[PDB]
Amino acid sequence: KELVLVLYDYQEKSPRELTVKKGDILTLLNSTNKDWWKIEVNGRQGFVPAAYLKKLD
Distance, CA of 14 to chain centre: 14
Residue 4, C-beta contacts closer than 8 angstroms, at least 6 positions apart: 25, 26, 27, 28, 37, 39, 53, 54, 55, 56
Domain of 3, CATH number, reads 2.30.30.40
The answer to whether 39 touches 31, Cβ cutoff 8 Å, is no
Angstrom distance (rounded) from CA 12 to CA 47: 9
| Contact between residue 28 and residue 55 where contact means Cβ atoms under 8 Å apart | yes
CA angle 38, 43, 47 (to 5 degrees): 20
Sheet holding 36-41, edge to edge: 44-49, 36-41, 25-30, 3-6, 53-55
Technique that determined the structure: X-ray
Q: Give me the resolution in angstroms, 1 decimal.
A: 1.1
Distance CA 27, CA 25 (A): 7
Write out the residue range of the structural domain in which residue 18 sits. Answer: 1-57
Handedness of CA 1, 5, 38, 41 (dihedral sign): positive
Question: Domain count of the chain?
Answer: 1
